């Protein structure tokens, strides 16, 4: 069989707390769907402020509760993931600022950059930093983002 390969970024302030939950989220619902082979996912920062850190032992451990597989080292966003990601999906509108900023200061802007949470079915169109929050925090980020790249999934390029 063959398909055409898309692929998704999913942004947040440090890329410890939220969106390695997301990417984590996305990669394992394609594996179930039969599709990873059609998508290429990673996840970045807008800020060096956690950058060569693993995810957020509060998010790691809300993953295991789940049974979702979890690794990542924190990376800052670069220039060239504004040309080669389909999609550039963030939490809140502070990432997005940023992410919009600095996509004008490239040559080639590919990405449609956009709030992961626009594809929630029950609006919560932010997804809020959990950091100086508890336990309920993170599974509160978990549900939004399984909620959030079901849709996504459903109507994607």
Sequence with gaps: AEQATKSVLFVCLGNICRSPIAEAV???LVTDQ???ENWRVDSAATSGYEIGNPPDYRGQSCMKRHG???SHVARQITKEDFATFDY???MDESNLR???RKSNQVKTCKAK????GSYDPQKQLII???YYGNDSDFETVYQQCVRCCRAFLEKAH
């Design 26 to 28: 996305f990669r394992k």
């Design 34 to 36: 039969n599709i990873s």
């Design 68 to 70: 979702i597989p979890m």
């Design 88 to 90: 550039i999906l963030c």
């Design 98 to 100: 940023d992410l919009n």
């Design 113 to 116: 950059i956009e709030l992961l």
């Design 128 to 130: 809020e930093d959990p």
